[PDB]
Amino acid sequence: TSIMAVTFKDGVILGADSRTTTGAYIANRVTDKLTRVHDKIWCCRSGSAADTQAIADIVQYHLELYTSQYGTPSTETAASVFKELCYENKDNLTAGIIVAGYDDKNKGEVYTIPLGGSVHKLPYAIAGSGSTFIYGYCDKNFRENMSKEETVDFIKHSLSQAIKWDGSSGGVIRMVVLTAAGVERLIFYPDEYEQL
């Protein structure tokens, strides 16, 4: 996988490739790695497909139950529930998860949860096998408070490169935009992003 989440002026954007792998065989070329755990709290999934799905399903369930009793959960709270699962089951899980959400108080937030189940709040986060190839690029090109169009471009260009060098990344680039205006799904096909 290649995944990332980026905070900006109006909120946060999540991005991902669409490749699922079964060895060197591409088991799914149109995977959706960006997943909803609440109206405006989403996650990017990397690692084991089974582990990350099982985790996201449980988290969605916890937050649905949270909502019923105490109203809308914060993005921090959602990240905490992911952590609890990842940390306590670290021996049996291969899950690299980025959590991203939009509050009206807190605006956009990104929490990354690597293999051991530690939590790290960041302006943006990258992860997955393909992310190694774009640490240089992303560190050089990210700024805070970018516009929506700048942030879409940053993600598009970054994942384009990750996909170019990483054989375990590919297909389409999916993105999910999280603002006060609601939730927007974007998709970009190879013929566009490849020749960037």
Partner 1 sequence: APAX
Partner 2 sequence: TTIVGVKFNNGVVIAADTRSTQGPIVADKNCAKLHRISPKIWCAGAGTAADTEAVTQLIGSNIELHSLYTSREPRVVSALQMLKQHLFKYQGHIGAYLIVAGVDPTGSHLFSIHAHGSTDVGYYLSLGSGSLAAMAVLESHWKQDLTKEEAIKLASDAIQAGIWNDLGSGSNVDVCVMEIGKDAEYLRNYLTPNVREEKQKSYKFPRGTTAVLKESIVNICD
Partner 3 sequence: GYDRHITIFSPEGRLYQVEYAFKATNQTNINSLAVRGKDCTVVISQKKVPDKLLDPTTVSYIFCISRTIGMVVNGPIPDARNAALRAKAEAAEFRYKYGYDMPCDVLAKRMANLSQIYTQRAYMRPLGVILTFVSVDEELGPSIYKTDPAGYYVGYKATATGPKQQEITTNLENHFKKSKIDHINEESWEKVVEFAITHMIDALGTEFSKNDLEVGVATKDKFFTLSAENIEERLVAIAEQ
Contacts with partner 2, residue ranges (CB under 8 A): 20, 25, 27-28, 30-32, 48-50, 53-54, 92
Q: Report the alpha-carbon distance of residue 174 to residue 33 in Å, rounded.
A: 8
- Reply yes or no on whether 1 is catalytic: yes
- Cβ proximity to partner 1: between 33 and 38 the closer is 33
* Residue 193: C-alpha distances to residues 76, 119, 137, 157 (Å): 33, 31, 16, 7
Give the DSSP H or E segment for 65.
helix 49-70
Q: Report the alpha-carbon distance of residue 170 to residue 168 in Å, rounded.
A: 7
Name the binder of 30 from partner 1, Cl ion, partner 2, none, CB < 5-8 A by kind.
Answer: partner 2
Subset of 38-57 contacting partner 1 (CB under 8 A): 45-50, 52
Q: Report the alpha-carbon distance of residue 143 to residue 6 in Å, rounded.
A: 10
Residue 1 touching partner 1 (CB under 8 A) = yes
Residues making contact with partner 1 (CB under 8 A): 1, 19-22, 27-28, 31, 33, 45-50, 52, 94, 128, 168
